[PDB]
Copies of this chain bind each other. A is one copy, B any other.
Amino acid sequence: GVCRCVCRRGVCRCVCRR
């Protein structure tokens, strides 16, 4: 349920666990 997200320039990449 917690995500680590890195965003820039119209894109977000997220890794989510619990």
Bound together, the chains give a CA A16 to CA B4 distance in angstroms of: 6
Between A2, A13, A15, A18, the greatest number of chain B beta carbons within 10 A of the residue's beta carbon is seen for A13
This protein's copies in its complex: 3
Bound together, the chains give a CA A12 to CA B5 distance in angstroms of: 8
Contact (Cβ within 8 A) B12 A6: yes
Contact (Cβ within 8 A) A3 B14: yes
Instruction: Enumerate 30 A-B pairs (CB-CB under 8 Å) in ascending A order.
Output: A1-B17, A1-B18, A2-B15, A2-B16, A2-B17, A3-B12, A3-B15, A4-B13, A4-B15, A5-B13, A5-B14, A5-B15, A5-B16, A6-B12, A7-B11, A7-B13, A7-B14, A8-B12, A9-B10, A10-B17, A10-B18, A11-B15, A11-B16, A11-B17, A12-B14, A12-B15, A12-B16, A13-B13, A13-B15, A14-B14
